[PDB]
Design a protein around this ligand. Structure first.
Ligand code: CLA
Ligand code: CLA
Ligand code: CLA
Ligand code: CLA
Ligand code: CLA
Ligand code: CLA
Ligand code: CLA
Ligand code: CLA
Ligand SMILES: CCCCCCCCCCCCCCCC(=O)OC[C@H](COP(=O)(O)OC[C@@H](O)CO)OC(=O)CCCCCCCCCCCCCCC
Ligand SMILES: CC1=C(/C=C/C(C)=C/C=C/C(C)=C/C=C\C=C(C)/C=C/C=C(C)/C=C/C2=C(C)C[C@H](O)CC2(C)C)C(C)(C)C[C@H](O)C1
Ligand SMILES: CC(C)[C@H](C)/C=C/[C@H](C)[C@H]1CC[C@@H]2C3=CC=C4C[C@@H](O)CC[C@]4(C)[C@@H]3CC[C@@]21C
Lengths: 155, 80, 173, 38, 743, 179
């Protein structure tokens, strides 16, 4: 079973354990001196991190468990980062494909591939901010998928 | 006892004969190319299978194919 | 050779005919980037910054009773209106107007200035003069507002006071 | 003396781009540490 | 008589970036465009191979002189970095105040992703990563007391790097020497023997006498580092040096009057380690540098250069001839003056052997102060120099094979030692292979036999102290002779060179510095294992060098080249037949031998030398005498050493050593990834790449540079590189974590 | 005696440099122009001359007035304490910001242009008041030489100012008035 970390004793126990681990090393140093301030910042960050993670769900071990079933209540856990990742990598892939398609139109595409043409490379990188829309219309026009490619014996 | 076979796509460039280290290949008159010559393997008993000829062939797909079959003293390259 | 900098040469891509030409481009951004796209970027950056500047100036004196008292600060107001849902509606009608003014050539690889000049996106309801004098005045006021908006928002970041509220009895840091 | 072309070669451009990407990631991680579940 | 003159060409090569935009310009084949992804790998593989670029020896010599300057500049930048880290991000002053309590550290990790935990509580106020490079001990031995000196040294290093940058560019674009230069081996040897080494040791001896000696004497006398006079004060005010060393009262007069015995206050030969710091007496070290400087200077006047006096290396080489060697060393002079690969092979073998000797001598006779008490530093330095030495040795073999395949000449090598060896290479390799088999059986079989006996409960039939005993009587005898040397064969020596041979133990800061390393049956077996592994690796390298040109399997290996994949699936199979492949195999064997060597040093040191000493002299080692009965079985080597000592690297999580643990896992991954490239062939990867390329073609996203699999030779190189990287990194993390957590 | 060609040293063979504004001295005893570009060295020398003249006049001017709104707890202008305090209060941090902006945005392009053989070293075309007259004519080459000499003197005087202040712990005017 899973329960919110804010209501799980294991989460608070872990927070106290980490704070104690930092305080043990912090006691050796002096209040105002090199170090000791370095450990106080860590303690504050620990408090903020646990307060932030309290909204997540965790079992008996107290470790935040992420629900990827697609439930809207857990969209921020996997749905939103998943969509943002797909957007970033689709942008990377689409700009790369367009740059390759442009280089193939040059006299020596190999030289362009080795020595990248920063002007055109940046021209295609800046664009593509609407790659999901550019992927379509390329597919509809038939300019995305090919027809005949290299195939060996016994196709 | 490797089997070396020459196919009709041979262009008679002689690179296979020049790259063969056992005098297994040679050039014979032919009329299938302007060079008027074709590669032949009349001494396949001395072949070892190094495939230097296959590497030296310029045709798209090697016009000379060496198939490793029966193994003998000559094919194993044993000086002892 | 450049008018702005007589010790460096004028960039080969820039030209005197386009509005605002001062030959000021030491880093040679005109090279490696389309002159027309860079010019369009300058025009829109200036227009958007000009409108933003007027927002900060007229926001001191609130005039929208429907939204009532607002934070009046850049960050706080943006966050407030983003959580209130009005910013999601503001993002809309802008992208639509971008797709409408550009006629679908929103991308940098799509935008082509065929029969137009950088910045000539229709929008001439009064049919007033568009000669190079008016275009140069437009780009100059756009640059002045591009600098002014940045200064105003930075002042709001450090002081938290509004532009005209900060100009009076000026306080040092 | 075409230094721009050399700077545009695959190793130089790749190292510069990856350096910028790593810098952006690191800067985001110190300004917004321990980011999880957006 | 040949004039040893300098002739150079001005503005031989223009300085421009035009060639920077054309990768592969140095090669005719690589300058035609990639056409495939293999060109990218070939570009780097043949980048430093100056002999393949041009056929002129002059150009290669210039490309080497330069790039040597570049590497010197790189070394100077690295040294400047070490000094700057010590001056800015290290607890050097605090360490000086309490060398035994403060842990050396010169690295501060930024707080970004929780990595701030790596900043261990090394003490001295600052918290960082503990450094085991011995930089702190070296700086202390050099007289450094304040961080201002460290900053000045870093700045000087940066300046020296800039000079080595300018020199490298100037000797290739402004003044490139001709081939006549670089072929003056007599002059180069005279200068390197009397100027680079002789004068260098002389200058270092002077620095020690005027800086290291007084500063260290005051430091060991309880004087605070801030209260010690500056190094320049000891030179300006002679009264201070006289007070610390009365010999200075006489000045340089005794030196010029041959009354060298008056320098008994600064030029001593005590022989032992200092009981205060645990290291060698700085006076003995200064006297040693003075003697080595005088000896090297005298040796630097042997060869003939621009004057009648001297010797000719060619004449000496040709003079050595005997009945069993027809022409003796005839033709070797021309070989070492017309082929940089031969010189590189000899120099790499000697440099590697020198590094290994350095490791042994540095651990046995700790030269720097407080070096012995810092076991982490001792383990890291011995292991580090041992590894660099082994790598240089394998490289020596590789370059010997390269010379044999490319620069060999039958006319030059006619009836000489090299030709006579190539003639009977079969006797050499078969007899050496027989020796390897005998060594492996009588070394590993003893271990296997002990495993079988212990498992059967028949402990009375083992090769141990209690059961059948194999005592290194010869080594033990040499140790006893060394123990008695300070009074019967070293009259002026006051103590044994190393306490590892005998004498008494030395303790510094409640820690053992150096105590007699008794040898038993376990040491007998491990030493034989070392000899066995060295024999097999040298057999592999020698076989590759002797058959590099030809063999009974491939009569013309030389024409195929030094680095070629194979001759094909003929003659039964000719895979890994080239000399390059022999070097590839020798790398794994050298790694195995070196790994076993470092394992023996680590375990033996932690079980019989390194440890703590309680009041009244009671000694307690890290692993109390377990090596005596646990190092005689493979099970003991896996339980008492690999399993027992690994607990520190696996439990390091949650502490400052967590990084090591992480590196312990990462290394494993790499070592396991290498298997991919070692148990596979490029035919399969090429087919997989064909399918992936078809997938790309279906989307019009195929690249112009045709994707190709790694070459057969490149695949072998990648596999060996990953294997060595993973193994050395795993043993590196294990050694460092184990020695830092305990001891 | 001497060699075939001469130098103002009167015992040296003239180097590549001939007769440049303020370069009539041909003071290159150690080969610096034989390996390094002359334009690069000229640009560096003029930049040094300008920054040093400003520094000398600035050190003297700072000892009279501190504006009264800057703490200036130390009356020594070339002391590390004053440098650190002004860096902390942000004054020198802002000078660094704008000076670096000038060097990257304009200084680097200027040096690249002069290294290619287009822009004369140290020529930024800054002549608000027609003091130098037409470029490359009377009142310009002489004025350029005067600038070079004044800058070299200012560089040597800045080194002297710093060393004297660090050794006497007294200001320039204070030291001039007493011992
Ligand atoms: C902080 C002041 C500032 C400055 C100096 C700029 C400068 C610029 N802006 Mg920007 N802008 C600003 C504030 C600013 N902006 C703010 C606050 C907003 C939100 C209201 C915008 C919204 C905005 C939009 C929507 C766009 C610009 C664009 C541009 C570029 C126009 C020039 C051009 O057309 O060719 C380009 C000249 C270049 C030198 C290329 C820029 C260099 C790289 C390739 C950019 C992105 C790399 C980066 C690592 C990607 C990560 C994500 C990114 C959002 C940070 C120019 C470099 C346009 C643009 O980027 O062109 C496509 C455009 O799309 N601006
Ligand atoms: C390359 C290595 C190196 C270098 C660079 C130096 C450099 C230096 N050494 Mg040195 N030294 C070295 C190695 C080195 N040493 C070695 C290997 C030894 C043997 C262990 C010594 C032993 C040594 C001693 C004992 C002394 C120096 C001293 C010095 C400094 C001055 C030398 C001098 O001219 O005084 C010359 C001194 C003379 C006595 C000249 C001899 C002939 C005179 C003219 C006799 C005539 C009588 C006359 C009235 C003088 C009375 C002198 C009498 C009272 C002593 C100098 C910076 C001296 C120093 O400055 O101490 C800090 C010093 O006393 N060195
Ligand atoms: C233009 C860049 C590009 C694009 C658009 C694609 C696109 C694609 N690849 Mg591919 N790939 C690339 C580069 C690219 N790849 C490179 C450089 C390599 C060598 C490491 C590979 C190796 C590779 C393999 C082994 C496989 C694919 C596969 C695929 C397909 C499925 C998704 C995937 O598994 O990706 C995987 C992506 C990677 C493994 C690494 C990508 C490398 C970098 C991070 C991205 C490329 C950056 C590029 C330099 C940007 C140029 C920008 C330009 C403006 C200058 C997909 C159509 C799969 C397939 O066969 O289809 C089903 C597959 O198995 N790719
Ligand atoms: C490459 C990507 C990258 C990016 C996107 C950023 C972005 C940012 N950095 Mg940063 N930085 C980077 C790399 C990067 N940095 C690197 C590689 C270093 C060196 C390790 C630093 C060191 C650094 C420091 C010390 C600080 C920042 C700060 C900042 C923020 C200040 C605001 C700003 O817009 O300035 C934009 C900045 C950049 C685009 C990067 C310029 C970095 C230059 C070289 C300055 C660093 C000087 C360094 C101390 C000494 C010489 C470095 C040498 C490389 C020349 C910011 C958003 C400041 C901050 O924390 O904000 C409160 C700040 O104090 N950065
Ligand atoms: C006493 C004179 C002398 C000295 C001290 C050296 C010293 C050195 N030589 Mg060298 N050499 C000499 C004479 C000398 N040489 C002569 C006469 C010849 C012609 C016969 C050669 C030909 C030669 C070759 C072909 C090579 C060397 C190399 C080296 C370096 C070996 C690398 C090393 O061990 O790192 C130790 C480094 C140091 C200890 C730092 C010290 C560096 C300083 C600057 C001392 C060197 C002075 C230099 C020789 C002469 C100054 C010239 C002047 C006009 C500035 C080393 C610095 C190798 C090298 O690395 O190339 C650069 C190499 O390839 N030498
Ligand atoms: C003073 C030492 C020295 C010097 C001057 C040389 C010089 C040379 N070697 Mg040699 N070698 C050496 C030592 C040396 N070697 C050692 C110690 C070994 C044993 C490892 C070898 C084994 C060796 C072989 C087998 C071969 C050479 C070859 C060559 C020649 C061409 C090198 C080249 O272009 O490859 C380019 C270099 C690279 C592409 C770099 C490879 C990087 C490896 C994997 C090292 C990675 C180290 C790093 C710490 C990894 C961790 C970081 C990582 C995470 C990024 C060249 C003249 C080749 C030759 O003669 O041509 C036919 C040849 O085949 N060397
Ligand atoms: C640790 C051992 C190891 C590892 C990690 C792998 C990993 C892999 N094998 Mg494999 N293999 C191994 C041993 C190993 N093998 C052995 C012993 C054999 C017997 C010979 C095989 C034989 C074999 C075959 C026949 C095939 C594979 C295939 C694959 C790939 C499968 C697809 C995949 O999961 O991609 C995911 C990628 C990874 C798991 C690698 C991790 C990502 C890396 C670390 C990121 C990039 C580097 C990173 C930036 C750090 C370096 C920075 C730099 C500065 C140094 C994969 C990369 C198949 C394949 O090609 O797939 C398409 C394939 O057909 N292997
Ligand atoms: C940053 C200082 C600097 C630099 C870069 C230059 C650069 C230049 N000078 Mg100039 N000069 C300087 C300072 C400097 N000077 C000062 C202070 C007086 C002069 C007086 C002078 C005259 C009269 C002339 C020049 C000329 C030149 C030009 C050609 C000669 C040359 O290459 O010298 C290069 C010099 C350097 C690169 C400086 C580095 C020199 C060393 C390494 C620095 C250390 C010096 C140190 C402070 C001395 C301490 C002494 C102490 C031991 C007692 C060249 C552009 C000639 C010219 O043609 O003018 C156009 C000429 O006639 N100089
Ligand atoms: C027998 C006394 C030496 C004790 C053995 C250990 C000696 C260490 C030197 C190694 C070489 C062996 C000495 C004989 C070698 C020796 O010096 O012979 C003498 C002879 C040298 O005399 P020359 O008349 O040729 O002299 C002219 C030239 O040397 C010019 O300098 O060397 C050879 O020609 C044969 C070389 C090896 C012959 C094959 C033997 C290989 C066995 C290697 C193992 C040695 C024993 C291992 C230890 C148990
Ligand atoms: C396009 C066109 C039209 C024109 C339409 C528009 C929208 C015209 C222009 C509108 C706006 C909102 C602004 C135009 C220019 C804005 C400028 C120049 C703002 C500059 C801001 C500055 C200089 C900031 C100054 C400070 C700074 C930086 C710090 C503050 O602490 C205090 C303060 C001193 C105030 C109409 C007339 C509608 C119809 C038809 O003719 C088509
Ligand atoms: C860096 C400084 C300190 C040192 C003195 C520099 C010396 C430079 C390199 C110059 C000065 C005089 C020498 C010089 C004399 C004449 C020239 C002409 C010119 O074609 C450059 C080379 C050349 C042939 C050489 C180069 C080498 C020297 C030594």
């Amino acid at each position: 079973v899973l329960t919110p970390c804010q209501q799980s004793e294991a989460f608070h126990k872990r927070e106290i354990n980490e704070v104690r681990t930092l305080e043990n090393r912090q006691a050796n140093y002096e209040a105002n001196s090199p170090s000791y301030l370095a450990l106080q910042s860590q303690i504050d960050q620990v408090h903020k991190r646990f307060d932030k993670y309290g909204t997540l769900l965790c079992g008996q071990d107290g470790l935040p468990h992420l629900i990827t079933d697609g439930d809207w209540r857990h969209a921020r856990e996997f749905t939103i980062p998943a969509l943002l990742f797909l957007y970033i990598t689709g942008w990377i892939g689409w700009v790369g494909r367009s740059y390759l398609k442009y280089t193939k139109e040059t006299k020596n595409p190999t030289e362009q591939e080795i020595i990248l043409d920063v002007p055109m490379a940046l021209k295609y990188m800046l664009s593509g901010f609407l790659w999901p829309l550019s992927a379509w219309q390329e597919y509809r026009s038939g300019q995305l998928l090919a027809k005949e490619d290299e195939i060996t014996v016994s196709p | 006892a490797h089997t070396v076979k020459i196919y009709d796509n041979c262009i008679g460039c002689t690179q296979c004969v020049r790259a063969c280290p056992l005098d297994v290949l040679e050039m014979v008159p032919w009329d299938g190319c302007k060079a008027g010559q074709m590669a032949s393997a009349p001494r396949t008993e001395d072949c070892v299978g190094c495939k230097r000829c296959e590497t030296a062939c310029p045709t798209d797909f090697l016009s000379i194919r060496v198939y490793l079959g029966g193994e003998t003293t000559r094919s194993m390259g044993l000086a002892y | 050779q450049s008018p702005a900098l007589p010790f460096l040469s004028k960039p080969p891509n820039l030209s005197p005919d386009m509005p605002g030409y001062r030959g000021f481009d030491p880093l040679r951004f005109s090279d490696a980037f389309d002159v027309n796209w860079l010019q369009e970027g300058e025009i829109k950056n200036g227009r958007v910054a000009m409108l933003a500047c007027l927002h900060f100036f007229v926001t001191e004196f609130y005039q929208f009773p429907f939204f009532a008292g607002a934070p009046k600060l850049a960050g706080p107001a943006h966050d407030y209106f983003v959580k209130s849902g009005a910013m999601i509606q503001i993002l809309a009608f802008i992208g639509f107007l971008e797709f409408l003014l550009h006629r679908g050539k929103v991308l940098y690889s799509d935008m082509e200035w065929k029969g137009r000049k950088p910045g000539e996106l229709g929008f001439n309801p009064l049919n007033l003069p568009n000669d190079k004098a008016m275009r140069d005045r437009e780009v100059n006021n756009g640059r002045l507002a591009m600098l002014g908006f940045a200064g105003i928002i930075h002042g709001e970041f450090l002081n938290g006071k509004m532009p005209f509220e900060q100009i009076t009895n000026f306080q040092p840091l | 003396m075409n230094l721009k072309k050399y700077l545009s070669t695959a190793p130089v451009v790749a190292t510069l781009w990856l350096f910028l990407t790593a810098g952006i990631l690191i800067e985001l991680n110190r300004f917004f540490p321990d980011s999880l579940f957006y | 008589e040949k004039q040893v003159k300098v002739v150079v060409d001005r503005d031989v090569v223009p300085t421009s970036f035009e060639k920077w935009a054309k990768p592969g310009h140095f090669s005719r084949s690589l300058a035609k465009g990639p056409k495939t992804t293999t060109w990218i790998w070939n570009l780097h593989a043949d980048a430093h191979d100056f002999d393949s670029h041009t056929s002129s020896l002059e150009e290669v010599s210039r490309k080497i002189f330069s790039a040597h300057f570049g590497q010197l500049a790189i070394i100077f930048i690295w040294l400047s970095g070490m000094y700057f880290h010590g001056a800015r991000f290290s607890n050097y002053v605090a360490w000086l105040s309490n060398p035994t309590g403060i842990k050396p550290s010169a690295q501060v990790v930024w707080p970004i992703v929780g990595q701030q935990i790596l900043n261990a509580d090394v003490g001295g106020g600052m918290q960082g990563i503990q450094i085991t490079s011995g930089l702190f001990q070296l700086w202390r031995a050099s007289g450094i007391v304040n961080e201002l000196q460290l900053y000045v040294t870093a700045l000087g290093g940066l300046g020296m790097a800039g000079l080595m940058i300018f020199a490298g560019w100037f000797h290739y674009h402004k003044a490139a020497p001709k081939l006549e230069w670089f072929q003056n081996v007599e002059s180069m040897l005279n200068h390197h023997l009397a100027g680079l080494l002789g004068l260098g040791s002389l200058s270092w001896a002077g620095h020690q006498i005027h800086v290291s000696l007084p500063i260290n004497k005051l430091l060991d006398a309880g004087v605070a580092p801030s209260s010690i006079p500056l190094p320049h004060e000891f030179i300006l005010n002679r009264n201070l040096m006289a007070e610390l060393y009365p010999s200075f009262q006489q000045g340089l007069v005794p030196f010029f009057t041959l009354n060298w015995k008056q320098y008994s206050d600064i030029l001593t030969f005590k022989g032992g380690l200092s009981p205060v710091t645990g290291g060698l007496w700085l006076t003995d070290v200064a006297h040693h540098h003075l003697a080595i400087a005088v000896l090297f200077l005298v040796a630097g006047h042997m060869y003939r250069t621009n004057w009648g006096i001297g010797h000719s290396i060619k004449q000496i080489l040709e003079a050595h001839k005997g009945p069993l060697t027809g022409e003796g060393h005839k033709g070797l002079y021309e070989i070492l003056t017309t082929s940089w690969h031969a010189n590189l092979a000899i120099n790499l073998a000697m440099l590697g052997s020198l590094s290994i000797i350095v490791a042994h001598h540095m651990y046995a006779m700790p030269p720097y102060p407080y070096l012995a008490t810092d076991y982490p530093t001792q383990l890291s330095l011995f292991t580090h120099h041992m590894w660099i030495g082994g790598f240089c040795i394998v490289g020596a073999g590789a370059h010997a094979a390269i010379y044999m395949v490319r620069d060999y000449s039958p006319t030059v090598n006619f009836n000489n030692v090299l030709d006579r060896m190539i003639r009977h290479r079969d006797a050499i390799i078969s007899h050496l292979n027989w020796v390897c088999i005998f060594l492996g059986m009588h070394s590993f079989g003893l271990y296997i036999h002990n495993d079988t006996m212990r498992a059967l409960g028949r402990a009375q039939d083992m090769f141990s102290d209690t059961a059948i005993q194999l005592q290194p009587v010869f080594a033990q005898w040499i140790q006893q002779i060394h123990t008695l040397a300070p009074g019967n064969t070293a009259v002026n020596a006051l103590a044994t060179a190393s306490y590892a041979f005998g004498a008494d133990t030395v303790t510094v800061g409640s820690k053992i510095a150096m105590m007699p390393i008794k040898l038993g049956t376990a040491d007998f077996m491990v030493h034989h294992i070392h000899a066995f592994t060295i024999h097999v690796t040298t057999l592999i390298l020698l076989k590759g060098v002797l058959y590099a040109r030809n063999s009974r399997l491939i009569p013309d290996k030389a024409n195929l080249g030094f680095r070629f994949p194979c001759d094909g699936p003929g003659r039964g199979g000719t895979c890994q037949v080239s000399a390059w492949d022999h070097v590839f195999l020798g790398l794994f064997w050298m790694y195995n031998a070196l790994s076993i060597v470092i394992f023996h040093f680590s375990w033996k040191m932690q079980s019989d030398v390194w440890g703590t000493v309680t009041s009244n002299g009671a000694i307690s080692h890290i692993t109390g005498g377990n090596f005596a009965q646990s190092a005689i079985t493979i099970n003991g080597w896996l339980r008492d050493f690999l399993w027992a000592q690994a607990s520190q690297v696996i439990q390091s999580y949650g502490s400052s050593l967590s990084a090591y643990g992480l590196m312990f896992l990462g290394a494993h991954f790499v070592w396991a990834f290498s298997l991919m490239f070692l148990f596979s062939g490029r035919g399969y990867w090429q087919e997989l790449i064909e399918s992936i390329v078809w997938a790309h073609n279906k989307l019009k996203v195929a690249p112009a540079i045709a994707p190709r699999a790694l070459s057969i030779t490149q695949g072998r190189a990648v596999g060996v590189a990953h294997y060595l990287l993973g193994g050395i990194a795993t043993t590196w993390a294990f050694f460092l974590a184990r020695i830092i957590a305990v001891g | 005696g001497a060699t075939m060609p001469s130098m103002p040293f009167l015992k040296r063979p003239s180097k590549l440099d001939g007769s440049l504004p303020g370069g009539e001295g041909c003071f290159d005893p150690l080969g610096f122009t034989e390996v390094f570009s002359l334009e690069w060295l000229r640009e560096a020398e003029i930049k040094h001359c300008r920054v040093a003249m400003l520094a000398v006049l600035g050190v003297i001017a700072q000892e009279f007035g501190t504006f009264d709104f800057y703490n200036a707890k130390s009356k020594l202008q070339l002391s590390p304490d004053l440098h650190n305090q002004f860096v902390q209060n942000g004054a020198l941090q802002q000078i660094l910001l704008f000076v670096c902006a000038w060097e990257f945005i304009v200084g680097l392009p200027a040096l690249i242009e002069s290294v290619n053989g287009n822009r004369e070293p140290g020529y930024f075309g800054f002549d608000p008041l027609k003091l130098g007259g037409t470029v490359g004519s009377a009142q310009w080459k002489r004025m350029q030489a005067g600038e070079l000499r004044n800058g070299r003197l200012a560089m040597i005087a800045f080194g002297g100012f710093f060393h004297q202040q660090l050794l006497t712990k007294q200001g320039i005017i204070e030291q001039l008035a007493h011992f």
